[PDB]
Design a protein around this ligand. Structure first.
Ligand SMILES: C[C@@H](O)[C@H](N)C(=O)N[C@@H](CNC(=O)CCn1cnc2cc(Br)c(Cl)cc2c1=O)c1cccc(-c2ccccc2)c1
Ligand SMILES: C[C@@H](O)[C@H](N)C(=O)N[C@@H](CNC(=O)CCn1cnc2cc(Br)c(Cl)cc2c1=O)c1cccc(-c2ccccc2)c1
Ligand SMILES: [Zn+2]
Ligand SMILES: [Zn+2]
Lengths: 400, 401
């Protein structure tokens, strides 16, 4: 269950000293990444999020207005052109505010939910880098909700539901929840923090989620909820964050025309659920020990003949699976069926569809799992229908 | 007028600002177009048997010095530093593709190896020269590098040419000008290697019956090239596609494979992009169609609306059915005149406006209006869904008539 070992074995990715903590995604690795993106996109649609894409770099002057420069400039990559200094984006929030600030906004536009697969770069110490877990370049399943003070509870409620919804897909049901309260140094009144902490608390209560306080660990600019999932080894992974922000919109001149016709500053909610896509792929690799659920598998089905005699039946079946939208390969090599099964088992291919004379003659196929189980000979169309359902449902469980 | 800048703002596709010169903020509807263009390219990558990879955003100046690009183009590169080490923000994807190729033992059986990437490139271009989506600092290349043997070059150039015209024809671009650039004075390799390389490009074009003009002496140091310039409906020239042979970079970056003789051999590299800059191509398409995108590219493909509050449930039902069919659809149940609603969706360039009166609800039908203003009449819901699915899946340039 070492993602670095499994990563090399299944040709998913590699790292080099020429680019510390920045992943070279190979074909099969990039297939997993993209299917994870497709999955998160389906949830973005289901929870009424926009999806945007921001530039990689923006003027340091803009980043100075955020307050991040003074506190995190040493963790930021910088580059200059024509006597102007640009920061390579470590976060997507300022970029999202720039898009919000294009066009006059009304209370009618709120809540405005803006998601991005945000490419972030952090100048992390090289010596502390570790595989996909501790990197310099990562992709955040990021979103910023612009909303009224009155909309916070409902919007945080929806974030909590989305968190549990997405973790459950991967078989993560043990979640530890922590609400971080007002720190010693903070902006706004004690009243603002009372209401803000209460909003996070009520949202968790509305979802029947038990939690505990991290007293005084809240950010300068608002309280947060943190979600720690536990893998099958009972190891803790902090992935999910919901962070209230009463600072950044004001700092970056974000406003909307209220129902009272007065100009108002929107509340900002930061949330990531997976956190780092790269890290989450790392966690899944170790969770499944490379046995990715069928919907995530680089190659989902290998169709294979026992002898040369079934080659054309394999070709027809491989085309049928291709047409069904399944990631399929034909193994037509002049090798023992045992040799083929062993190789594709080692490559963690969910299903091996074996075609002998008996299968061809009956219009059936013999189904073998990477777990070494023989499901027997089944109707081709019934198997294809079943594989499609398992893939569409993003099921953790293989055919019975 | 068909200014991509004007349409980009009007349809909420993108914006650019002084704090990020020549770099694009893609808004929801613009990012929808970008992603559909990506889906299209990926369909071709599968058909033409390409792998798809993702490389790091930055790599050590030391490696960029090995390529030779540093000496020639250091001023056009963005650089950043960490722990007394200088890094270049990648202006090209080729060195990264070699890095992935160099991982794992390669044999002649692995060739041709076709490696594609939607490659984030950055060029430190003069800020005064930037304009719209056409000249930018940050762009995305529909890039690929083919690692092949000398013998495989002609066949791989042939497939590249077919892919180029396949993609350009999808968008209705049939006027393509082609230029073959031959050996310069300072070049690598034998006169014989250049003889074979130039012939491979020429014969590939001739066999495809592609008229081309030679650009004698204008080829690169490291090999000859074909360039494809497409013309829009205003007869403006856009150089988008390149097929560039490279007998230099694989050697420079220690690329090798085990030949059939079990001896180490340097692979030939083919650089190829078809759209060129994805951002620029979207700009070209925005102007070509004047924001009237073909249905498959349209941010919102269908709007379903009611005549009274009686049909509001039937509209919601039809809206869900269209969504399940894989169509980008929205319901408009607002208390506004039908003439007001249809004008808003026509201005937003929605291909199809589906209207539900009592006659439509009763018959299980829907009235279909095109954004051009053609009334196709009251048609069977399932007939309409299947017609829309076919138009989208075929990526048809034309709407139902
Ligand atoms: C959800 C986003 O919209 C939000 N902007 C954000 O990135 N929040 C952080 C957690 N928040 C913080 O970490 C705040 C403190 N902090 C820390 N390091 C920084 C480093 C830089 Br270079 C800059 Cl500019 C700011 C900060 C900063 O504010 C966050 C939330 C969830 C997962 C992860 C994460 C987990 C594992 C790997 C990578 C990232 C990070
Ligand atoms: C297809 C890729 O695999 C290949 N690497 C590549 O990018 N080729 C260039 C055309 N090639 C050249 O232009 C070669 C000369 N050149 C010029 N400027 C550079 C600037 C830098 Br900063 C560096 Cl590092 C290298 C070069 C370089 O080699 C190419 C090909 C097709 C469209 C476009 C393009 C068209 C419009 C906008 C943006 C890009 C560019
Ligand atoms: Zn944020
Ligand atoms: Zn290249």
């Amino acid at each position: 269950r070492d993602h670095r070992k499994i990563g090399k074995q299944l040709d998913l990715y590699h790292m080099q000293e020429e680019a510390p903590g920045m992943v070279f995604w190979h074909n099969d690795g990039w297939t997993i990444f993209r299917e994870l993106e497709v999955f998160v996109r389906s949830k973005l649609k289901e929870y009424q999020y926009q999806e945007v894409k921001g530039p990689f770099m923006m003027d340091r002057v803009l980043w100075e207005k955020t307050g991040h420069w003074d506190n995190y400039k040493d963790a930021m990559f910088t580059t200059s052109s024509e006597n102007r200094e640009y920061c390579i984006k470590p976060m997507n929030c300022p970029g999202h505010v720039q898009i919000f600030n294009q066009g006059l906004k009304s209370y009618r536009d709120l809540p405005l939910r803006m998601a991005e697969f945000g490419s972030c770069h952090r100048n992390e110490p090289s010596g502390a880098l570790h595989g996909l877990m501790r990197v310099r370049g990562f992709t955040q399943d990021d979103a910023h909700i612009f909303c009224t003070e009155e909309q916070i509870r409902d919007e945080v409620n929806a974030c909590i539901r989305m968190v549990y919804d997405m973790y459950s897909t991967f078989g993560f049901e043990k979640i530890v929840v922590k609400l971080s309260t007002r720190p010693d140094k903070r902006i706004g009144s004690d009243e603002m923090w009372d209401r803000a902490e209460a909003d996070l608390a009520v949202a968790l209560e509305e979802n029947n989620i038990p939690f505990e306080y991290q007293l005084g660990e809240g950010a300068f600019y608002g309280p947060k909820i943190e979600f720690t999932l536990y893998d099958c080894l009972d190891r803790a992974w902090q992935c999910g964050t919901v962070q209230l922000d009463f600072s950044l919109p004001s700092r970056l001149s974000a406003s909307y025309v209220g129902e009272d016709n007065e100009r108002k500053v929107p509340v900002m909610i930061h949330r990531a659920i997976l956190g780092s896509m790269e890290r989450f792929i790392g966690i899944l690799t170790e969770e499944f020990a490379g046995f990715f659920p069928t919907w995530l598998a680089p190659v989902q089905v290998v169709v294979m003949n026992i002898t040369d005699s079934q080659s054309e039946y394999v070709n027809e079946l491989t085309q049928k699976l291709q047409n069904a939208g399944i990631r399929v390969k034909a193994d037509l090599r002049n090798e023992k069926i045992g040799f083929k099964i062993r190789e594709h088992t080692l490559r963690r291919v969910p299903y091996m569809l074996v075609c002998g004379d008996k299968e061809v003659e009956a219009g059936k196929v013999a189904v073998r799992t990477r777990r070494g189980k023989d499901l027997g000979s089944l109707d081709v169309n019934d198997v294809i229908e079943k594989l499609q359902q398992e893939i569409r449902s993003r099921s953790l469980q293989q055919l019975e």
